[PDB]
Write a protein that binds this ligand. Structure first.
Ligand SMILES: [Mg+2]
Ligand SMILES: [Mg+2]
Ligand SMILES: [Zn+2]
Lengths: 81, 246, 49
RNA sequence: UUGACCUCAAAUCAGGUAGGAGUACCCGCUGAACUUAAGCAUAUCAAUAAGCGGAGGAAAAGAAACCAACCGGGAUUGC
RNA sequence: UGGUGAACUAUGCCUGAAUAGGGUGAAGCCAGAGGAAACUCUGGUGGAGGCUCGUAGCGGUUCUGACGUGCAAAUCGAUCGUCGAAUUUGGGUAUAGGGGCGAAAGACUAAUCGAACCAUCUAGUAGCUGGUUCCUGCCGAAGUUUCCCUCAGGAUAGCAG
RNA sequence: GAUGGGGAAGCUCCGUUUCAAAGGCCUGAUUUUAUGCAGGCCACCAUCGAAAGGGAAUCCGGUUAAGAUUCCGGAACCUGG
RNA sequence: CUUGUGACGGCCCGUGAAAAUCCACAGGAAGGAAUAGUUUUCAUGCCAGGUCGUACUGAUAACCGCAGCAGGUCUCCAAGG
RNA sequence: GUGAUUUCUGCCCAGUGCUCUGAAUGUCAAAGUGAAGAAAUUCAACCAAGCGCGGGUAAACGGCGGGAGUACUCUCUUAAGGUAGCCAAAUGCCUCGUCAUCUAAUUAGUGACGCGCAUGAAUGGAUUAACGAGAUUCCCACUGUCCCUAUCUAC
RNA sequence: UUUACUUAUUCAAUGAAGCGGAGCUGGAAUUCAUUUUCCACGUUCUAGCAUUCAAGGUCCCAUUCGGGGCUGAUCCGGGUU
RNA sequence: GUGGCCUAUCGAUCCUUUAGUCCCUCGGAAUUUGAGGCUAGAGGUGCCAGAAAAGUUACCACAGGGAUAACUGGCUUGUGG
């Protein structure tokens, strides 16, 4: 009974939500996220996972400060009014 | 081939010793000043059972000579020690059972136990139940003592090493048959995960050197060289002789 | 090379144990048979004469 | 006793700086096998892919412990 | 090559929990009797055992029953093994892929195991199988020679344009 | 599972009291006063880990379409000050 | 009958957690009364008790098995013959 | 490794392993030493462990033969030659072995026999109470398994 | 090949507490002139107790509430053993 | 008369080595060792136009094959009847 009766015993999560990415990939016993690598300082990325890099790279979010850097450069980082 | 069972034992994943119900390391009192210039008197408060150990332990209380407090040491109980007995530890201690005299100050034929190898490691030799060390001879110049060990070997150790006079309590245990796989289960359940033992000749050849074949047989000789490597040392390692002698 | 090993592992030993261990290891029979082979080496010359 | 020197510390001491992201191109380390040899082990793939460390608008290299053998040339880079 | 899994399951640890009613009647003890003494006998008491019949529970022997495009990628029915322990089990925790764990079947490691899964190298290689897209006109074969780890393949000569 | 350390080219690995100068505790004293200087005491030595282990203290009656040992009425208890 | 508990008895080469936390004792540091104090482990009296969860199912239809699947999934209460 | 108890575990160290505190130039690396050379280099001596020589070891892996004479003895071969036990056994080709028993009839079962293709002693041998969803034979009871089929209910 | 030496290196313990040398004070000791040495150098019927820079002695201070130094508890070398 | 009366009686590249020329080269210039070349032999591939090479799989896998076995059918009928 490795199929249907064994699927009834599944009610204990191995992963919960992660703090940096909100992914539900944070392993409870390992205390590590399997997608972004929290709590390591570097973010988990691999050159074989180029599509995953495309999924989580810069520009897939809000860019709350980086949207204005090109415009401030074009104006020359001016000050005043 | 796979990694065999005795090869897997050294990682210590499930092969660590079960130490939940143990009462502390049974060591001798440290050799500070009193034990090497005079003696010191302590008291046996209780004799208790140690989990996974065949011998009982003794809880001996001394006074700290430098601070107002009490020290509690765990000795291995000698056969004949009772609760409320005064235990004397030191160079000038009188020769009675339970006392912790150094080996330079006991005569020929003395039976001691919990013997230090070097002066100060707080007990190494003859600690299992019913075992003892006999003093075979002295050597004052180049101050050493010869001792007979429980294995029958004769060691030559320092005369400043200490030992508890008498034999370890709880002797004669292995004379009783266990009679039951349940009894062996409860015996090893508090020691470590090394039981039950599957024979390697009953395995598959991926799992052991002895495994495989259309009959259960070893194949090559079971005596293994000392220069063999891990994964090969399964059998009788470096056997000088085999068989039942008559 | 042999003398290093005796200093390494047989320094603390007495002659009763030494005789017991060489009798249990069977080298004493080899020494006996080597001296015996010397004895028939002399003895065959004596029988020839 | 007092005052130096040397060395080593402590401060939510005064002021600073490093980490992470990106990584097409750049500077290094580490490092395969599929494949080809009509098999295969040196070889090849390849001083490559994957992995790790570190920069900039370029980086690196760069003003000879050079090339030459000629009636000698003259930093580096690229075609 | 680099990562992800012990939510199933294997094993150890830590902390909890669960297990009707019967049968047999072990030590210890009490009374009576006998004996010269050792000690024996009889009647009770007591309630031992990896004992036994048998529920809940755990498992899965047979019908090679049902079903077999099923209720179900392993179930249903009857018959069964076991049922106070080497028992069953929750949660926490540890062991990760030539590695783990195994009362040992090459078993189990998320329906995947005589080496898991994911992505990349990778459009891996194939003397082997299958396919290969409009018309008309003209010419029109070979299965033979020699060499090859050659015998389902090539080179070379021949035949053809 | 950090730190002190020690490996590792490195991502990181070991170790958890270790070859560390590892800290805070009460009385107060002073009443330019702030909290130093009077003192004296103590050496564990991060932290995480149980909604079934340990653990301060609440019960009854009534009430809603849907909440209650939590609201209402009454009657208690514990902790800190 | 279910359950709680007490005093016992049997078993073991099995003798069947730890820490936070609270109390007591030994000790005698120090502070202390006579026109006055000393005591808040006695009684009464005063103030405050933050944050998050709290509905419902828990299974032949609320979970997992592609589903409103005869499967699987821990536990408490338990009337009469 | 073997697998409760009882009773035993015979012979063989030649081979393959394992192991010696033996004896010591046979094999004999790098470094080092010596000679020749102008040097690169060449040639020798010396030379650690391990091999090689000498022992031990079978509850180590394993093995347990032939020819004559009268079960016995002798002789060869080899390291030693199957001991105690057991058997057409789950191990026997021939084989449906031979004898007895069980039946009307038995390639099945059981008890014996043993030149046993190719049984055999911790590769464990023989025996064995109790136990077994283990394999096999016979007997009593019992029955639609069958002679030989018929009928009824629910879906 | 044997054999010193310790500071490199290595192992172990401790909250780095009693190391080494010399000296007292006793005992043995035979001294052949005066001491050569060697052992000691506060604890053993009893499941109590042992802590407040220590009492005492002594010397200062400015007496008072007390405070400090030496000794009690032998010197010397800072090599934790 | 350019081996055996005739028809069989044998071997590439790379590497090593020998003989000859004592000839050519070691590329800044020479001498001498050393090395590399040219011409002709030898050391050998017997699977003989010339890979350096043990098994097992009843746990097995892939690409194919009726070019190829284990059934029936078909031809034949030795053998059988
Ligand atoms: Mg186990
Ligand atoms: Mg085998
Ligand atoms: Zn994350």
């Amino acid at each position: 009974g490795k199929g249907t009766p064994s699927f009834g015993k599944r009610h204990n999560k191995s992963h919960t939500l992660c703090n940096r990415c909100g992914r539900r990939s944070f392993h409870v016993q390992k205390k590590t996220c399997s997608s972004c690598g929290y709590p390591a300082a570097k973010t988990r990325s691999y050159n074989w996972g180029a599509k995953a890099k495309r999924r989580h790279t810069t520009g897939t979010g809000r860019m709350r400060y980086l949207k204005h850097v090109s415009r401030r450069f074009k104006n020359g980082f001016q000050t005043g009014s | 081939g796979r990694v065999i069972r005795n090869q897997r034992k050294g990682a210590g994943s499930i092969f660590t010793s079960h130490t939940r119900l143990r009462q502390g390391a049974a060591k001798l009192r440290t050799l500070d000043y009193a034990e090497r210039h005079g003696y010191i008197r302590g008291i046996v408060k209780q004799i208790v059972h140690d989990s996974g150990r065949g011998a009982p332990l003794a809880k001996v209380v001394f006074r700290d000579p430098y601070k107002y407090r009490l020290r509690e040491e765990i000795f291995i109980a000698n056969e004949g020690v009772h609760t409320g007995q005064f235990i004397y530890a030191g160079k000038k201690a009188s020769l009675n059972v339970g006392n912790v005299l150094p080996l330079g100050s006991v005569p020929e034929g003395t039976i001691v136990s919990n013997v230090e190898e070097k002066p100060g490691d707080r007990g190494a030799l003859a600690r299992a139940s019913g075992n003892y060390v006999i003093i075979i001879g002295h050597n004052p110049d180049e101050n050493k003592t010869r001792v007979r060990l429980p294995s029958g070997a004769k060691k030559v150790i320092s005369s400043d090493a200490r030992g508890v006079i008498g034999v370890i309590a709880g002797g004669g245990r292995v004379d009783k048959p266990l009679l039951k796989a349940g009894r062996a289960f409860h015996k090893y359940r508090l020691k470590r995960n090394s039981w039950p033992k599957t024979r390697g000749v009953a395995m598959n050849p991926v799992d052991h050197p002895h495994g495989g074949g259309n009959h259960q047989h070893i194949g090559k000789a079971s005596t293994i060289s000392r220069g063999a490597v891990s994964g090969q040392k399964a059998g009788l390692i470096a056997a000088r002789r085999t068989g039942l002698l008559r | 090379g042999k003398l290093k090993k005796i200093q390494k592992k047989y320094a603390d030993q007495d002659e009763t144990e030494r005789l017991l261990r060489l009798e249990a290891l069977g080298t004493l029979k080899g020494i006996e048979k080597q001296q015996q082979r010397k004895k028939e080496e002399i003895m065959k010359r004596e029988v020839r004469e």
